[PDB]
């Protein structure tokens, strides 16, 4: 859990001569610093 | 046997306890430390009393035994 | 190194709904909150007064729902008794006029050649004597020379013992400069003095005082060869005398002198404050929920109402119950309810009598009954109602009729109705209505319903803050959040603190910092009408 | 005549309970019960010591005053000489229990040292004390 | 011996009290005879009681009902929550706090000279009660080697010898030893494994301990009222 | 008990003339040096 | 921002300036795994010179300054960190601002 | 008769010893009485013991505990590996090596004058012990014709007559005879066929022999301590 | 590190240097099975010239030194081996260190 997620497909490698080029995508780790929660009350009737 | 008494033994114990630490400063009636030290000193007092009595009994017994004065 | 380890958990064994009180008291410090659990603790703290009676009532209001962890405060701006003699300053621990009758007085014992202190306080059957003041050690001489003397003097810049010298004739054997070195205490000094070939500094037989080396008194030119001379240090030794037992503290501004068995002065209870705003602020962050002032004043009631509203604005919801006067007519009660008109305030109409454990048939105003109602409410579970609960009041100043009760309840006033031959008590609470008279709104009108809502929100807020804020955001976080909420909601249902909740409605969304959540609940209620119809049938 | 361990422990517990109700756990493994048990053991050991002293006094106290010594059984002990071929070229060490014996059928008695001994380098012969392993005149 | 004591309630009658307690009004004359009451038994207020304080009782006066009451066989539902807390506290015992400074003797569990007494901050010896007491005793038993304590061969645990290899067998041995040590305590109704794992050197495990329930502790303490010891010699 | 465990499938053998090339995997032995135990208390009302 | 007293295990009451508090935050963060944050974590401090109000904490946080609050609502009080915000001003860059 | 002997350990007490051995501290006075000890029973070092060597014991001195000990009923887990080796060696017996020069009497198994004594290389008679002893005895029994040995009709084997035809029947006869011969030995717990084949003239077979286990041999030898024979007359 | 005394079968209370203890440790290690540790095994030493404290033991082990700690009332002996550490002080490397 140092990173959130990453798609394996995006890991592409180009090799040519003495040079190696690599592309990737990573979803950075994050930490919660806000919580918003909504509550709703409702009537109920029970029978039998 | 020097015939110590309960009060002096308890006082000595409490004084040493205070001298070895400044944290303990509650030796009022009903406190745990005071009850424990009181019980210990009472048992010491009873040991001393019975030791005195046993020595008296022992002197009488040695007088009987030495001379065979049944 | 290799080693074994052991852990223990206890979180599974277990809000508490703490109850508060402010009023007049005969003892304890001013402007200071305390936590009370036992009656002996309150009696030690609060010597007497109405506040102690209110604490007793609260822990004896109901047989089955007495409250706990009551938070108490003294409103009297009292001061402690004090006195001055010679170079001493005398100050008592107790605040108020009670400390004036503490008796203090220094004497001298000729056999020991030592000062003596005796403190007596006949109200608590206190009587003790601190014999052998000073007299820390005895200096003795075993040689056969012409003379042998010692000398200790103070350093005037700091009033510390500059030197400590032993002499044979005129010259010195060994001198201990007490202002320096490692000889900070007298025992370091005596342990080395006894090692001299022909000198002893035996610590006094009156206990091991073990006083600072710098605080030794000023004695010079005294015969050791003829007398076991005493170095005293009276003021420093008084700390050992009053180390643990003693009502009165002492200080030195100078020389100390004996004096008569004199009583203290200056002890003042003080007038009561006109406004309790500064007093009330101390309960800003104490965690209390129900607070009841011990006062019949409408100004105090308005101040408390403002205070509980402010705390509820700050995320700390609070409720108040008020009352006053003896045998207040219905007009005054309606005027008080119209003046307040607050959901988070409840008014009590009836005043009566209570049988204390001490045997006193204490006839009290109405706010003492509001204390008792508050202590019963706090005793109840979260969201349980004080409707039809026994009160155990001995008698009441009025017996309202079925029309008077209906008028009081329609005006949002709590009232107690006389009832005969019930198993518990001869009285019960008719309703848990608030001053807000909008009966259509169940949250504001009913004390129970709004308390359930407030405790539900506060517990949800605290748990969400404690758990997930400041942690990591991973794939499992959302599922975990949903599981934790569902578990919490199932716990609440299991405790009967809600009616029911649909589990599927709980949704969680996570995006960067935020965590958006939504849910549905069916809230708790307690019955207020019960109907039963019968049908008769026969066979031919 | 004398108290014992169980009685001392019981009285200690009863006095502690009477002194205060702040302690009520007196089960095995409790710190407080362990402390009282240790005191009780020490007191019982002092009782045995007093019993031994009085049993000695009964049969030897009076007669001893008249210059009469009761002959105790003792281990035969004495000094022996060990000679070296030359001055020692280092500190020799003889541990306690080092055995000395005789090459005869007349004296199968075995003697041993009861203390450690050191021979300095400069020394050439050192005397030590040995104690007969058996009490009696056989040593 | 113990008896019930009744406080006179507002406009109460002796017949109602008799019906309430004895289950029949006929005992009201016995109640009068035992309490030595004159004909106006329950006066309205203290002004009437001034006429004859000895033989009359007013509202708020305490009557005695000579029925042999006993604290056991009492419905736990009546008992107040604070009373239940105090009762379980008495049941689980009070003891001098020695497991203070958890970190230190947790860093040196197998060694001696690991724990010590402490002060409560009010100049008196520190004390652990109820659940804290049970924690202290269970920690001390688990930490104590078996047979090392004087006067108590069986008290302790064999964990000091179970520093064996890293295989499931030694894990099972540890688990069985810990269950034995926990079962040895009389107050522990049962104990059982939750989860364990091995991380090479380090072993980790956790257990679940069910102490005796509130009802059982209440019954035990209220039974102890007959003897008055209110102490634990288990 | 002289090793912890070994996967049998990982053992490979190759033979070519004189040589015999071999490869395998093992989980090696250890003896415990920390033992941890946590307790949880619970009650019924 | 905060400075306070740390009660040493040796018994000395170390009434120390704010950079020792920063040392305590750095020693706390060093032991935390990569990606974690010191937000809402306990600081293990005995006392602080100032008890900042909600308005003060909000102002310090918006200005990119770390502060500590004293929680009294709970049954047992402890000091906890409010945020791990850096001195960088623009909040639009979450990488640099945290 | 046999008793336990205890070496005084560092800062040990008599109460601890009593608890360790008798399972109760109360026997410490009996331990003092039997050992004839003065009040400082376990002195710190030998300097104190010099004051009264007869009546005092120091660290490293041996005490006697008069508990009737017996070498049987002892947990084999305590026994040292060398001690177990010696015990099984005693159980399986020592005998003069006669099966030396295996090749020679393997080339002439059926004939007489095939084996002889040998020297150990140290000028003493050669000896075979433990497994070598069992090998020697089993070889000698199998090689001996049955009834040829004086004073022992049944000792031997009938293989000298089983030089029959090359069919499975004679193979089975050989196998049964060999199993009989091996079973005849008391120490052989069981024997069973592994594999056999026929190559025209030559027959070949192999067997598996399970001698008595280490535990059984230990129990037997430690039981023999009661008699002190420590010898084999099977 | 530790040197002490051993009770010979002949009855000698032989006070010996530390390498004799290293002999005893080697003979115990060789006695153990392949890969079994000499940790916490009894040694049966009569006495020792020093009794190191829990801090001194921690310093010796952190410096890759073997040490013996006094222990009371155990079933076998009054001493045990604390660790089987080597002189190579790289505790991260388990092969070289243990």
UniProtKB/TrEMBL annotation, chain B:
The chain holds residues 1 to 70 of 348 of the full protein. This is Baseplate component. It comes from Staphylococcus phage 812.
From TrEMBL, chain D:
Residues 93-139 form the Baseplate protein J-like barrel domain. It comes from the Viruses. This is Baseplate component. The chain holds residues 2 to 140 of 348 of the full protein.
UniProtKB/TrEMBL annotation, chain F:
This is Major tail sheath protein. It comes from Staphylococcus phage 812. The lineage of its organism: Viruses, Duplodnaviria, Heunggongvirae, Uroviricota, Caudoviricetes. The chain holds residues 540 to 584 of 587 of the full protein.
UniProtKB/TrEMBL annotation, chains G, I:
This is Major tail sheath protein. It comes from Staphylococcus phage 812. The chain holds residues 393 to 490 of 587 of the full protein.
